[PDB]
Every structure is written in structure tokens, then in C-alpha cells.
């Protein structure tokens with residue numbers, strides 16, 4: 451029922467999910483001049499060498515690549531995090547034009563798209579239990595700007611034809627998420643929420659300062675996806691982003707000076 455259109459989009463979500471007006475909602479605008487460098491943040495550890503991708507899926511809101519999270523293969527540790535968080539899936543949010551598409555903004559700047567690598571805290575045993583905790587999830591957010599092509603994204607782009615419409619999936623094994631990361635792991639962090647229903651307030655956000663560059667041709671292939679299922683009126687999957695939400699009492703911390 452929920453979506454991104456005029457009658458079902460983010461301004462409607464609070465009716466089914468009243469937490470949409472909560473105290474720790476995401477995304478937010480990252481005011482880079484208000485964020486506090488925190489010299490005590492431990493270093494961030496992104497350990498993706500043993501990642502096992504499984505499937506790529508159009509879920510009617512984004513497309514996602516799913517991973518085997520039955521053991522500690524691809525994990526995020528350190529930084530603001532206590533313990534070990536396992537990679538479950540990544541997906542993207544993007545625009546109809548290159549000047550919008552990201553969920554987080556940086557000094558009000560929107561990027562063309564935003565990559566989310568979703569992880570769950572292993573002390574809670576499964577993602578469903580993790581979803582119910584205030585420290586259950588950690589999402590690594592990476593901005594995309596249009597310029598040079600990202601070679602490590604091309605295998606993803608090339609399979610999107612096969613998952614055009616909601617409900618379609620394909621095998622997507624041996625994909626290496628390391629190829630999606632920028633050079634620097636400098637980041638901002640704050641406590642927030644899922645940016646889609648059910649908008650659960652259980653996410654530690656880690657948003658990288660350095661965007662990755664992707665080509666116009668790569669983002670154009672995202673915009674050929676459809677929100678609708680096969681047979682229904684064609685509605686391009688574009689502008690699948692929630693806008694910035696109130697910061698409320700929160701502090702954004704920077705890992706860098």
C-alpha cells in the first residue's frame with residue numbers, strides 16, 4: 451500500500467506507522483558544521499572479504515541484493531558499534547534527475563542516489579528480533595554522484611533488465627560488495643530509524659563522507675526499473691527516497707576532523 455507517490459508517499463506513512471513522527475527518525479540533514487568530531491570513536495571495520503551474495507530482487511520499492519547471513523561472513527564492527535553486525539542486504543534510493551535521489555543530505559545537498567548496506571546485531575540472533583531493539587541494526591550509507599563509472603557496480607546494472615517489475619528476482623552469486631566502497635571510511639554517525647515502513651527506531655546510521663562516482667548510463671539503468679508488477683500500468687521506479695526528518699534532540703558525530 452505504501453509507496454512514494456502523491457497518495458501513498460512519505461507524507462502518508464504516519465497513518466499506518468505512527469512512529470514516522472517519532473524522536474529518532476531517518477534520514478536527516480547532516481549539518482557538517484554542527485557535527486562534533488568524536489576522538490573516541492573506535493576505528494570502523496568493514497570486513498567483506500567472505501561475503502556470499504545470493505539473489506537480486508525488485509521489491510516494488512527498491513532493488514536489493516541479498517547475502518547469506520547464517521554465519522559471520524561479511525560484517526561491520528567498530529566505530530560507534532558495540533559487537534558484530536552481519537550484512538543482510540544492500541539496496542539503493544535514487545531520483546528522476548541527477549540532483550535528487552539521496553535520503554540523507556549534507557548541508558542540504560542532495561546526491562543522485564544513496565546506497566544502503568543493511569546489517570543486524572548478532573547479539574539478537576536474527577534480523578527480526580534485531581528490528582525490535584534500539585541497537586538492532588546498522589546501516590552503512592554511501593552517496594552516489596554522477597561522473598565517472600563505478601566498475602564494481604556494473605554487474606548490478608547489467609542484471610536490472612531481468613528484474614524490471616515488482617516481485618521479480620534472479621540469481622546473483624559471487625558479487626563483491628567491496629567494489630562499491632569509496633577510498634575513505636570517514637563517516638558521520640547518529641541514532642535513527644529505517645527510512646521505509648515500518649520505520650523502526652533501531653538503526654545506528656553510519657554515513658560515509660566520500661561519495662562514489664557512477665556514470666549517467668549506470669543511474670539511467672536504475673531509472674528503467676518499475677514500481678509496478680508485470681501487467682500493471684508502467685510507473686518508473688524513480689524518486690524512491692524519504693526526505694530529511696526532524697533531528698529532534700540528536701547529535702551527529704564525525705569520525706574525522
Ligand SMILES: NS(=O)(=O)CCNC(=O)/C(Cc1ccc(O)c(Br)c1)=N/O
Pocket residue numbers: 509566568577578581587589643644645646647648
Ligand atoms: N532504507 S533502510 O533504512 O536501509 C531500510 C530498507 N527497508 C527494507 O529493506 C524494508 C523494510 C524492512 C522489513 C523488514 C526488515 O527486517 C528490514 Br531490516 C526492513 N523493505 O520492505
Ligand SMILES: [Zn+2]
Pocket residue numbers: 541542543566645
Ligand atoms: Zn534504504
